[PDB]
Each structure stands twice: as structure tokens, then as C-alpha cells.
Design a protein around this ligand. Sequence first.
Ligand SMILES: *[C@@H]1O[C@H](CO)[C@@H](O)[C@H](O)[C@H]1NC(C)=O
Ligand SMILES: *[C@@H]1O[C@H](CO)[C@@H](O)[C@H](O)[C@H]1NC(C)=O
Ligand SMILES: *[C@@H]1O[C@H](CO)[C@@H](O)[C@H](O)[C@H]1NC(C)=O
Ligand SMILES: *[C@@H]1O[C@H](CO)[C@@H](O)[C@H](O)[C@H]1NC(C)=O
Ligand SMILES: *[C@@H]1O[C@H](CO)[C@@H](O)[C@H](O)[C@H]1NC(C)=O
Ligand SMILES: *[C@@H]1O[C@H](CO)[C@@H](O)[C@H](O)[C@H]1NC(C)=O
Ligand SMILES: *[C@@H]1O[C@H](CO)[C@@H](O)[C@H](O)[C@H]1NC(C)=O
Lengths: 49, 99, 285, 50
Amino acid sequence: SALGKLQDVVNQNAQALNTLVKQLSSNFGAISSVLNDILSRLDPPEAEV
Amino acid sequence: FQPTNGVGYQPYRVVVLSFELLHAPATVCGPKKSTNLVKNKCVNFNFNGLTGTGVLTESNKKFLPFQQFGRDIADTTDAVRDPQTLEILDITPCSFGGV
Amino acid sequence: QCVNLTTRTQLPPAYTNSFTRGVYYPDKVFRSSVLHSTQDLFLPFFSNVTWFHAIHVSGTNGTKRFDNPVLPFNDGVYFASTEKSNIIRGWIFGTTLDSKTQSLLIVNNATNVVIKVCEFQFCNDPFLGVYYHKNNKSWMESEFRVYSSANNCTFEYVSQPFLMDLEGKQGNFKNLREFVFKNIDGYFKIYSKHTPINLVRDLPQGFSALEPLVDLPIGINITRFQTLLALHRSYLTPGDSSSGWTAGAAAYYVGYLQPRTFLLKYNENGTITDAVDCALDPLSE
Amino acid sequence: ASVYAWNRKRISNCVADYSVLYNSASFSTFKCYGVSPTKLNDLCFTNVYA
Ligand SMILES: *[C@@H]1O[C@H](CO)[C@@H](O)[C@H](O)[C@H]1NC(C)=O
Ligand SMILES: *[C@@H]1O[C@H](CO)[C@@H](O)[C@H](O)[C@H]1NC(C)=O
Ligand SMILES: *[C@@H]1O[C@H](CO)[C@@H](O)[C@H](O)[C@H]1NC(C)=O
Ligand SMILES: *[C@@H]1O[C@H](CO)[C@@H](O)[C@H](O)[C@H]1NC(C)=O
Ligand SMILES: *[C@@H]1O[C@H](CO)[C@@H](O)[C@H](O)[C@H]1NC(C)=O
Ligand SMILES: *[C@@H]1O[C@H](CO)[C@@H](O)[C@H](O)[C@H]1NC(C)=O
Ligand SMILES: *[C@@H]1O[C@H](CO)[C@@H](O)[C@H](O)[C@H]1NC(C)=O
């Protein structure tokens, strides 16, 4: 535990990247998160919404 | 059924095949088709319900006898087993970047 | 062939603690060296389950402990039986058990397994029958008085025939069979795991990952179930169909699942080697 | 069977290949009622009475 800052920087970057990746599987108030299922199983207007 | 009558007094074995939908999950359905295994090319694949785009290499990730799909620490599709032949493939997106 | 058995005293059941058991694979996804955190129905750690007894010894002055109550079915059953002579031999899952609704019949008799789904008129004490002979020395499955009548059935299932041991071996228990029965979205998914054992008392400590076995699409509303044990009618105990039956030596544990978060630990091959709870102790949280 | 004792043949848990019925030359009537015989290869059912 001597090079704490050099490891903490990499850990923070990895956590930021992981959060950015995981923010793709959220509904955000929509029906689902996959776009093709949304545009296939729904009418054009609600799909675009 | 005397074998001397006309064409209107002969046996007619009739089948009354019917179809109906209950609330239980469907267990009898029609057949499905399959294409060739074109690997080492960024194509569109759909094995059993999942979609995606990317080359399909032949990696060495050994799955369990009952496991079918495969993911990573990022929770993304990475390796799908072929249904016909028990050969674990590997999914990796093809070339992309800036010029 | 319904027959109400007699000569069976009453006694308050025991409660043995479950030492970190009841962890099964939630899905069919492969993960290598991933500390995945899932949320599904599991058994809380360090929770005691009901210990049903089934024994008949000379010390027992006419008790003949043969327990098979109609237990409830809330969300799942962590069925675990420590057998040595193959006593637990099926289950009679159902909803009403009065020949009005369907009931899942899973019984592995002498030949093979028959997963039948039909409307049956069950008795008040279902069991199997194995008769011992003093001339050729062979245990034979004779009595099959589980139900009394059939009706218009549904999707059934059979398997290839085989022969088990069917012998009253002496000594401590040598087998352990764990099961998890979940029923959601018209899917009665069953998990299983068979590990050896050399214990003679309450469920041992350890950890095992139960693998999926079958996903029969039956679509029922099972909310109450029971067990299917087997007696050991031999030349020793005399009498009739109501009195004079042995019970062997076996025991089965029954637990109930509850919704709670768990933290799994996948190995470098895909097998769960260890898991931790989320709501047990502050360190676990 | 007989006309008053028509025996049913409820069958499930299979893969029904309908491409063998209408591609035959041994029947006399194939008057399906609103099932699109050429489209039966993409419709799933629960029980098939016979
Ligand atoms: C499917 O059939 C092919 C030959 O047509 C065979 O090579 C393959 O092993 C079969 N798959 C299974 C799962 O039996
Ligand atoms: C067993 O007892 C129950 C309740 O007393 C009764 O309904 C049932 O008919 C009895 N069984 C037989 C075989 O008579
Ligand atoms: C065992 O479980 C029962 C549940 O009804 C209850 O007495 C208590 O939670 C436990 N008791 C002991 C002594 O473990
Ligand atoms: C076991 O069950 C099968 C299936 O019903 C049956 O064919 C066989 O005769 C049974 N065997 C005994 C010993 O009851
Ligand atoms: C074994 O002996 C019993 C008792 O007589 C008899 O019923 C049975 O058929 C015998 N079985 C064989 C395989 O000899
Ligand atoms: C079986 O028969 C009962 C009563 O005649 C009927 O209500 C039910 O729909 C039938 N089919 C089943 C249970 O699959
Ligand atoms: C994982 O699988 C490899 C391949 O056989 C094996 O050598 C290794 O021991 C396994 N790891 C275990 C069992 O923990």
C-alpha cells in the first residue's frame, strides 16, 4: 500500500467507465431499454417517443 | 358398405383436426429453418432469441453442460453456444474507429 | 386402495438449523471470475427448518413415527432428505387433492419415473408398499395406493426403466438429495443436487450449487403439497392392512423460500464456489 | 372408429410438420377453415385434437 494515488486514479476511471456502460440498461421512463424491440412491438409514434 | 354401390355410398374416412389456444405455454408448433455457419465476418446472428452484430470466432471458453449464453464483467453478450453443434463461439464487434 | 393407518402417536416436531445451504443457479448465463449480485427467491442463511422424523426402533414403544403432513406451498420448498434405503420416493404436489383440480404427480416407482399431470382422488395417507420375503430374499414393490381414480389427463412424461437398490442397509446415512421447487409463469422448474454424506444427525454444514433439472410446462396453481414415503411390511410385524407395518429409517427437511438479495461468486470455470447474504449481519451487508 | 363413438387423439409436446398433408395426392377434401394451411409453419398451439 505505497502507491495509493496511482491505483486510486485507475480505480476511479474504471468505476466511471463501468457506470457509463451500465447506464445503457435503464428504462429512463420508457417501456424497455432495447431499441429494436421498442420499434418492432409498438406503433411508430410511441416508439419514437 | 357393399362393394357394388355408386360413388355416393362408399366409406369416407374423415379427420376433424382442430386447433385451440389454452392459457398454458405452447408446446407443439411448426418446424424452424437454419442457415450456414459463416464465421470470421461481421454479420447479423439470431440463434435462439438474441440478436447482435459482429464476427463469430472460435474461442476456448468452456461452458457448463446446461449453460447456453455467456457474459462478462460488463454484463454484455460475449459468447453464445451454437444450437446444432456443441461448439462455443465468441462474439466480438468488428473494426470501428476514426479516420 | 385407500386405507387409514393406525398405531401412530403424536409428538412435537424438531427444528434443525440450515447452515448456509439453498443456493442455486438463477439463470443460464456464463460468468467467469465475476462477483455478480442477483436478487431472487432463496433460503435465508442460519434459518431453522422443520425436521420430520421417520423411524421405527425397539426403543419406540409403539410410536411408529411415520410423518407425512399436508404442508403448505408459499413460494418454494427446499426439500432435503437423508436416505440410506431409498425411502422418500416421490411427491404429490397439488392444489386441492379432492378430484376437482389437477395435481402434479411425480413418483419414481420400481421401474422408472412418471411425471403425470391429471385429476386424482388421493386418500388421506398416501404411501408405497415394499414386501420382504424369507424364501427368495427379494424386496418387491407391490402396493401403489397413492390415488383411487383417474380422469381426463394432460401432458405426462415417462422415462426408461431401471432398478434401484431396495434393501434395508444398516448404519448411518450415506446419501443426500437436495431439491428446490419453484412455480412461476406456468413453469414448475425443479433443481437437484446429489452429494455423499457420512452423518447420522441434523443436516451437515457446507455449500453446494443446485443445477436446473427440468422445466415442465404444466401451468397449475399448486399451493399445498405432501410427501410420498414407503413402508417395510415384512414377516416380522403381523396384523392387517391397517396395523403391522414397519417404517425403516429416514428423515427429510422442508424449508420455505423468501425474497432476499444474495451476492454470488463465480469461479474460473462457471461453478459457484461461495456466496454471501445481504441481510443477515452488518458485516454481511 | 364409428360415427357415434368418435375417438379423440389429443396429442401435444411435438413438432407438427404440416408440409406432408397438403403435399400429398391421396385425399379428396382439404377445406381448411381460416387457418391458412401454407402459414401453419409459423403458428404455435397448445393442444391438437384429432
Ligand atoms: C443435428 O444434425 C446434424 C447433421 O444434420 C448433426 O451433425 C448434429 O450433431 C445434430 N445436432 C444434435 C444436437 O443432435
Ligand atoms: C379415513 O378417514 C377419513 C376421515 O375420517 C375418511 O373420510 C376416509 O373415508 C377414511 N378412509 C377410508 C378408506 O375409509
Ligand atoms: C425454529 O423455527 C421455529 C419456527 O416456527 C421457531 O421456533 C424458531 O424460529 C426456531 N427455534 C429454534 C429453537 O431454533
Ligand atoms: C411403475 O410404474 C410404471 C408406469 O406406470 C408401470 O408400468 C410399472 O408397472 C410400475 N411398476 C410397479 C412395480 O408398480
Ligand atoms: C419370491 O417369493 C415370493 C413368495 O412365494 C413369490 O411370491 C415371488 O414370486 C418370488 N419371486 C421370485 C423371483 O422367485
Ligand atoms: C377435463 O374435464 C373437466 C370436467 O369434465 C373439464 O372441466 C376440463 O376442462 C377437462 N380438461 C382438462 C382438465 O384439461
Ligand atoms: C477448472 O477447469 C480446469 C480445466 O479442466 C481444471 O484444470 C481446474 O481444476 C478447474 N478449476 C476448479 C475445479 O476449481
